[PDB]
Amino acid sequence: NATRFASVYAWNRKRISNCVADYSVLYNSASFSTFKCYGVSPTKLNDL
Amino acid sequence: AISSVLNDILSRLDKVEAEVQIDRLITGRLQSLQTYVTQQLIRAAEIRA
Amino acid sequence: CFTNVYADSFVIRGDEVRQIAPGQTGKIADYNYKLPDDFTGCVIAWNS
């Protein structure tokens, strides 16, 4: 929920650290079409 | 496979996305045993002789 | 030939269609309707 995103050409980066990640918040949202992963399975993200 | 460590697959993937990775490690480790047991069987014949 | 056959009938939203595929996860697949990991059969669906 940033107000305005960057363009794909100039893509933004954030270092996320020293904090707790609860991806089940993101995965339990209906809001997304796309939530596809490539070295982990999304339900396991919380166990890690 | 995405790891050499069996638990690092089972702690990162679900019960379907893991099976392909695990079957790679089974195939590789099993062919490692068939190599070793072939070497040692053949070697045994040298010691027997 | 088929030994026994069960047709399971229900309605869902169009987006939630992919959750009916075997071994998926999501609000339907978690606590409404679920296929086993070694399911045999067909998921047949149409916009209603």
Three-state DSSP string of chain C? CCCCCCCCCCCCCCHHHHHHCCCCCCHHHHHCCCCCCCCCCCCCCCCC
The answer to whether the Cβ–Cβ distance between C15 and A33 falls below 8 Å is yes
Task: Tell me which method was used to determine the 3D structure.
Answer: cryo-EM
d(Cα B45, Cα B47) in Å, to the nearest integer? 6
Chain A residue with CA closest to B16: the answer is A41
**C24-27 long-range Cβ contacts below 8 angstroms, 24+ apart:** C25/A42, C25/A43, C25/B14, C27/A28, C27/A30
B12, exposed or middle or buried, with CB in 10 Å at 0-12, 13-18, 19+?
buried
Half-sphere exposure (CA, 13 Å, Cβ side) for B46? 6
Whether the CB of C25 is below 8 Å from some CB of chain A: the reply is: yes
Whether the CB of C40 is below 8 Å from some CB of chain A: the reply is: no
The answer to whether the Cβ–Cβ distance between A48 and B17 falls below 8 Å is no
d(Cα A24, Cα B25) in Å, to the nearest integer? 30
Q: What DSSP state is assigned to residue A9?
A: G
Instruction: For residue B12, give both structure tokens.
Output: 């990162």
Q: Which stretches of chain B are DSSP H helices?
A: 6-10, 17-48
Q: What DSSP state is assigned to residue A13?
A: -
